[PDB]
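=== Structure Prediction Worksheet ===
Name of assembly: unnamed complex
Input type: mixed (protein and possibly other molecules)
Chain count: six
Listed entries:
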Amino acid sequence: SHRKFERPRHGSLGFLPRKRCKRLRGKIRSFPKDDKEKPPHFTAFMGYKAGMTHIVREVDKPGSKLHKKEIVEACTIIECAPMVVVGIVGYRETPKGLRILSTVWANHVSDEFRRRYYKNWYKSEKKAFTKSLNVPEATKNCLLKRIEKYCTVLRAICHTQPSKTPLRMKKAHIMEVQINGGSMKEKLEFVKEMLEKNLPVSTVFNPNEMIDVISVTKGHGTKGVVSRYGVKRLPRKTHRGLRKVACIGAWHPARVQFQIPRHGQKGYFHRTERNKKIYRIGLKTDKNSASTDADITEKKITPMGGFPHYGVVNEDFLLLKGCVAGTKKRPITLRKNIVPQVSRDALAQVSLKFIDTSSKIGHGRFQTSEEKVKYYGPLK
Amino acid sequence: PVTKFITINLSKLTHKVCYKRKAPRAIKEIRSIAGKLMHTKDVRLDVKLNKFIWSKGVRNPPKRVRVKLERKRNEKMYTIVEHVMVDSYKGLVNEC
RNA sequence: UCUGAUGGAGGAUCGAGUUGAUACUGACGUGCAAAUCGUUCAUUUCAAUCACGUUUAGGGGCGAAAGACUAAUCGAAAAG
RNA sequence: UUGUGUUGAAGCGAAAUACGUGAGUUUUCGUGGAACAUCUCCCUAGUGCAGAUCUUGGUGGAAGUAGCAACUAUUCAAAU
RNA sequence: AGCGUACCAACAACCGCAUCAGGUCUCCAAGGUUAACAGCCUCUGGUUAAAUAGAAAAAAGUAGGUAAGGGAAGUCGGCAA
RNA sequence: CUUUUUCGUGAGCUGAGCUGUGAGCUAGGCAAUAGUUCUUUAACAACAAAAAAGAGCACAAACUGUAGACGACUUUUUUGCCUCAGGGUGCUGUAAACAUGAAAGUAAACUUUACGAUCUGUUGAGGCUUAUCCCUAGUGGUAAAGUGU
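=== Predicted Assembly ===
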């Protein structure tokens, strides 16, 4: 018979199977739809999760109970050292999907890039990408002309530079960033110009821009159905334990349905979250990356004492409004929105007044070590 | 054959273990560390070192122990581990 | 008649032990165990508890009475 | 009644250009090491098994699985 | 005069099919705190043994702790705490 | 197969001569035979031998902890990593010792000597701080090379 009382099901069936992700790197399922009018541009980037802080900003929402007050917002810091563009891939449309015509490489690729091709780079003799980089410019241009002739989707292979980060991992993270923009010829030329140089975050994104983040959630091993699906605990009197689903199906069908919550892996899932706004693109060069016009204090983003479990952000970075899936040191893919957003929130110009850099270990009371020593005075 | 003086941070080796296993875990860690460092499989702990590790009961061993590892020739090689009484541990590094 | 002591009565009270067994309808339920384990609980000067000895034997015994118990066997034991 | 056996009987394992429609019969090779048939006719019975939660004995899959959990706790060195 | 006189008395020597967390009568009886032969710790005596160990340490179980704000709305019932 | 020869393609030579090849023209003389059929052994792909010509990794190990029941996964293996130390950042809350120092008061000598919870100074001290914190071309170390292709 029917349920006495209705209530919605536990968890979403759209994120099944809740199995471990194939890879650690976030992977774009689909790039934003190409608009032929816009000039050619990159659509994606990759950084590493450094940590989180909070900022103070002035709201500009008329009719909102906040409006003219200064509110505190949680922000995630993503260390975005420039990538290197190393290759070009052309895709053509076939009834069986996208088919690669060819991928052409740059003349020089870093050992950081070549490391990704090895499980034991240290004891190998690093012969990868050694004799295929001496191809003549004639055949390179032939392949490029064929790509321009027949391909409809252009992507640029680019790789991160983990040496610029505090990461222990040395092999770079490689992906392909789809070039959205003008004609095929314009895309080809756009990527050919910067076929070997650095790609900073500033070229890909702008401040106050809404983006999407693709990354693998924090892992938790096997978790019970209570913590994995949110099912209700059984009463205290339950004979064989209470942390389980009581009925895992009706008598018929004489099977367990795939919609029934069970124990299993929790976390380490691939998630693509939409609409994280960029609050600031901090530059490696400047000494006041964490300063504001209402702060005028000379300070950088890294909190007093380092980013816990991460290190120090010595490179370009971006300050993302809100939270982002993954642990510290996790590679995080940033993607342009599938269609440009025109909402008030997406179009707003954030003007932050203060960026916190107190210690995130313990309860820090100082923004700078100079301030701490000034307050305490001389010691033993 | 060689002699080293090292400090072992026993706190980070017994950090996760239960109350009733901290001192034996510290002993096991000391043996394993000395064996790894000396590249020998047969390592003998001095009874005075055992006494020092157990001096405060199973519940807590010293956070750090300053210790002397000596290699001797009698498969053929082996190592002796000896406690070193120190008034402090600050500024005390590994030396060969 | 009242007040203060003294005195030390009672199938008086609390409570370990002993003797039991209220609840968790806990554990266990291919047990440590054909009735145990944990916590909780009842009981302790009396109709109290224990030992050994001794008496009552099967349509019989014994029963502060549940058809209870009478050698893991009881609305008629066990053996042939 | 008339036969086979140490130049290898019964039994058993695998079989067969074998016979039978079939219960079976008959052969071969191996193993075995001492008995065996009689279909000439007949007499006799404790005479034919897939089952009976059959009886006794042996052996499986389960499975290198459940498990080897009360009693706070072990360590260093030596001897044998 | 004759007979008994070793040893266990459960913790593996008894009865529970066993080297079974059960059962099984008596006597002696230290110190501290305390009302106390209670609980907790200690001296003499005894032991460091348990049908196993090592590592890891998630789910789940079991035996527990602690929880903001609310305070029986839970549940047959304040069961359990 | 021989001869008369014509027109198309390939080698080597220099738009071009020759040789091979394919398709032809004239003339000539030369063969098939297994007893009546038993699939008409006829295709394709592969393989072996012999001749002739040219043509690197992964696992394990140690490390890591973005991972984890075990596998698996993320890493590093000499500008790295592990270790200890120094520094930072925090947590707790002012260590031991010493003081003709204090201390409610007390007792014992002919104004000092003893006892004293506690307090003060040296002392925001001391201890701890990655084991899953941060920084350091700071110390010491970084081990046999075993397996598969």
